[PDB]
Subunit: 111 residues, 2 copies
């Protein structure tokens, strides 16, 4: 229920200096994201394929849901790590607005 | 990326007889759903609380993400079981449209 990383960058955007300070970590996260999203799409495709061929529960369905679950969990965890990277690159006085947005979105299920 | 159960009921709604045949299983799923959504909200709240008090990675963050991941996986699995219950309660000649919607939505990541 919400793209946490995009919510943060939109609601409390980095200032000019912070954008420079975080450039490398933003690049590395964008790549990590992508990689995990690739795993996630493949897992969804495997689930869809299993069910298209055999429209019933089977061990392939159980396994594909486990694979989806873990890839989604991995993306949530990698995104949180990068959310803390961003917080580290903020001016300290900007952290309270950041925390307001972060906590509120987490409570709503944003990842 | 999509409420699979709602997508099915909207795109290929049950006919009058099928609605009657599936009434019990729809009631039981609505309840199971709710229960799992309760777990999910609590897990999100725990994650938000951990991070509101300690804005950094900790074992409480790791654990809360594991709890979210498993509750989301459980909801996906329970929803699939109920999706197969619905398919069982359809007239056989309605299953091809149902499968079209189901497979297409799964491929897109709907749960
Ligand atoms: Co960022
Ligand atoms: Co239903």
């Amino acid at each position: 229920h919400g793209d946490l990383h995009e919510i943060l960058h939109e609601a409390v955007p980095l200032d000019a200096n912070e954008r420079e300070i975080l450039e490398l970590k933003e690049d590395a996260f964008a790549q990590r994201r992508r990689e995990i999203e690739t795993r996630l799409r493949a897992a969804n495709g495997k689930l869809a394929d299993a069910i298209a061929k055999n429209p019933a529960w089977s061990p392939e369905v159980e396994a594909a849901t486990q694979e989806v679950e873990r890839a989604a969990g991995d993306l949530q965890r990698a995104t949180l790590v990068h959310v803390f990277e961003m917080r580290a690159g903020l001016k300290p006085e900007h952290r309270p607005a950041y925390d307001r947005v972060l906590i509120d979105a987490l409570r709503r299920g944003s990842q």
